[PDB]
């Protein structure tokens, strides 16, 4: 999270940390008692690494009563996701057991209505990813407010050159951006999950290359089919 600051601990109880071999790998949002939504490209290079989800966390290292590390029973990448593209970059992880809900662990309802967020709208995104151009990572959760950028502008040849489909959305990236390690995390607009951070192969903070986010509403039927 470039250009932001440390969040209030446990003020976003849906925030999750997808872990690979006991280290933070990607963000994630709890969308059901036993399911966490994340980005499919997080697990492309994971190989046989141990995939776990850390819930109720603010600091990745310090002890906190609400922190609980869950094993993953089942990983469901979107069947049409591949390393070559950013399309369908969604991942659903089933926890070993239903999460212990509380004031620090609560599922976030995701947007089921397929409307674009009006441009300029400020949306909230959080993660444990890069926080400065030096590429270093923070221990406690960071967050920032980002204005939404319309798809046609985002598709200009200077920006993402027609790569932003109807199932994707952009936010400005001038000094404020989501970075590597924020992938799979939530882009909340109006207190509802609107987009999932993809990023991955993009350097952040360059206004020339806006941040990309997978619109959850475009994949409502699939999410329902997996969670059913």
């Amino acid at each position: 999270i470039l250009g932001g600051r440390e969040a209030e601990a446990h003020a976003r109880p849906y925030m999750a940390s997808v872990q690979l071999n006991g280290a933070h790998l990607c963000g994630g949002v709890l969308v059901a008692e036993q399911w966490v939504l994340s980005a499919a490209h997080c697990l492309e290079d994971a190989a046989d690494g141990k995939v776990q989800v850390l819930l109720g966390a603010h600091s990745l290292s310090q002890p906190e009563p609400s922190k609980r590390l869950y094993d993953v029973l089942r990983a469901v990448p979107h069947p049409d996701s591949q390393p070559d593209t950013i399309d369908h970059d969604l991942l659903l992880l089933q926890l070993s057991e239903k999460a212990t809900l509380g004031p620090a662990v609560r599922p976030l309802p995701w947007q089921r209505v397929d409307r674009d967020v009006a441009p300029g709208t400020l949306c909230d995104v959080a993660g444990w990813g890069i926080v400065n151009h030096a590429g270093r990572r923070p221990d406690s959760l960071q967050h920032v407010l980002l204005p939404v950028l319309d798809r046609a502008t985002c598709n200009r040849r200077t920006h993402h050159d027609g790569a932003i489909t109807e199932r994707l959305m952009c936010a400005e990236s001038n000094r404020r951006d989501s970075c590597k390690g924020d992938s799979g995390g939530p882009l909340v607009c109006g207190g509802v999950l609107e987009g999932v951070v993809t990023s991955g192969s993009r350097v952040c903070g360059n206004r020339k290359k806006p941040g990309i986010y997978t619109r959850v509403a475009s994949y409502a039927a699939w999410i329902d089919s997996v969670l059913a």
Partner: antibody
Amino acid sequence: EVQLVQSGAEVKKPGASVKVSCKASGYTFTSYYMYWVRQAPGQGLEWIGEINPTSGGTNFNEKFKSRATLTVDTSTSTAYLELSSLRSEDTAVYYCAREGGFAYWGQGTLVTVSS
Amino acid sequence: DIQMTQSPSSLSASVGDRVTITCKASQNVDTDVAWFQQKPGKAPKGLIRSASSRYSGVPSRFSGSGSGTDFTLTISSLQPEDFATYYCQQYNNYPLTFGQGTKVEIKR
């Protein structure tokens, strides 16, 4: 198959206005800017302006800002360029092109301005 | 306004020759440069964007180089259908500007 087809040739008097259309098909019209290029006979290319089809917002070359108008009918996936206060130096072929993705271009529209 | 100074104005070569076309920007435009091909009476056709990225269906013999101010269109093995006019375009800054063009003729 994606294609941008433009309206037919037009002949106008050194004072009238002209409105050229550019109907897109084969892709989501609202996902890409549309920019307009002009080419005088036996001459180079010249950038007129672009339009955001969802918001109607435009960015113009200052040379054309005062007397050009770009509009859009999202229901018919059509983009329009209106040039008023015509002069003989406006006699040229007018192209529409899509900003971003594969570089689709219209076939062109010839606009002749003479007395 | 950023000037795109294309060189040379015309150029004569044979089939199979390697040919170079040049475009110099009056200030940095990063890699926001595109190359177009145009044959008489037809609409311009896209070849390269982002200085070096070919479009789909463009033969591999076309290649683009450059970042900053100096950009180069290269045709490795000139084919008969390649003899035409080529334009460079800058889209880094409003207004977008073209080069005056380069005509590629057959040597005889």
